[PDB]
Design a protein around this ligand. Structure first.
Ligand SMILES: *[C@@H]1O[C@H](CO)[C@@H](O[C@@H]2O[C@H](CO)[C@@H](O[C@@H]3O[C@H](CO[C@H]4O[C@H](CO)[C@@H](O)[C@H](O)[C@@H]4O[C@@H]4O[C@H](CO)[C@@H](O)[C@H](O)[C@H]4NC(C)=O)[C@@H](O)[C@H](O[C@H]4O[C@H](CO)[C@@H](O)[C@H](O)[C@@H]4O[C@@H]4O[C@H](CO)[C@@H](O)[C@H](O)[C@H]4NC(C)=O)[C@@H]3O)[C@H](O)[C@H]2NC(C)=O)[C@H](O)[C@H]1NC(C)=O
Ligand SMILES: *[C@@H]1O[C@H](CO)[C@@H](O)[C@H](O)[C@H]1NC(C)=O
Length: 209
């Protein structure tokens, strides 16, 4: 004795993109070789659901199994604050273990998005940094990408959301492009996906005129 349960929320980009699959993951550790069977029961706002997929158990190096149940959440249900409950049953458990999860509960706040052209010190060089400042958003769940002429620009680094003095979040996204591309006057756009924006999406464009 005995097993432990950990419940994980979906990835932010999965929650914000219609083509992606947002999943809540119920992980059971310390499952015995003697009694390796785990019964998973799932509830959405107290209502039982039967659409979760279990994965084949894995032997840990500490000679125990790690057993996982993955529940697909509806994009709208997750955003509307529905509660996801995982109930775990196992013979080595006198009473089942339950864990509940839902989206962060504070008041949603819309991100403010600003673009920063390369600084004269930054601009003289071979490759230039284009910056997208995203601040004042809540919850921290967000997705920031770059684009030009309808195609993704992949040479970017986005900082993790940082908790600010007023309890909201902020981050920077920096795209590195060849100076020649920026200098030419090509339009680079910063894409921001967040629940509180109108239509959960905004974009800010940056170009040298
Ligand atoms: C046998 O060996 C096993 C494998 O090594 C080992 O399993 C490990 O067991 C420990 C505890 O014994 C368990 O620890 C918990 O880990 C939580 C994070 O797990 C994440 O992230 C880690 C690394 O950061 C990864 O290794 C995990 O795979 C898992 O990854 C996430 O997985 C999901 C689904 O797969 C993905 O969607 C995510 O992308 C992914 N993230 C990453 C970064 O990869 C960690 O959060 C836990 O801390 C919290 O719970 C503790 C419980 O004791 C608290 O003490 C601690 O304070 C934290 O509290 C929680 O946090 C908040 C505070 O209230 C609230 O959210 C919660 O209410 C609260 N919970 C409470 C109080 O219960 C925690 O340390 C490891 O995850 C696990 N590793 C794996 C791989 O399974 C076994 O223990 C070994 N057996 C032994 C030693 O006997
Ligand atoms: C651009 O900014 C990134 C991230 O802040 C940094 O690592 C890099 O060295 C800067 N300059 C260029 C030319 O990318």
């Amino acid at each position: 004795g005995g097993p432990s349960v950990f419940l994980f929320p979906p990835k932010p980009k999965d929650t914000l993109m219609i083509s992606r699959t947002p999943e809540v993951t119920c992980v059971v550790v310390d499952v015995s070789h003697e009694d390796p069977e785990v019964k998973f029961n799932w509830y959405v706002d107290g209502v039982e659901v039967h659409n979760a997929k279990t994965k084949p158990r894995e032997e840990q190096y500490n000679s125990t199994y790690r057993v996982v149940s993955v529940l697909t959440v509806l994009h709208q249900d997750w955003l509307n604050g529905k509660e996801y409950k995982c109930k775990v049953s196992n013979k080595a458990l006198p009473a089942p273990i339950e864990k509940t999860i839902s989206k962060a509960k504070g008041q949603p706040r819309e991100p403010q998005v600003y673009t920063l052209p390369p600084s004269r010190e930054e601009m003289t060089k071979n490759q230039v940094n284009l910056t997208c400042l995203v601040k004042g958003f809540y919850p921290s769940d967000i997705a920031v990408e770059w684009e030009s002429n309808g195609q993704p620009e992949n040479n970017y680094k986005t900082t993790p959301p940082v908790l600010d003095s007023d309890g909201s979040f902020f981050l920077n996204s920096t795209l590195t492009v060849d100076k020649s591309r920026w200098q030419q006057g090509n339009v680079f756009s910063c894409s921001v996906m967040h629940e509180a924006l109108h239509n959960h999406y905004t974009q800010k464009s940056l170009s040298l005129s």
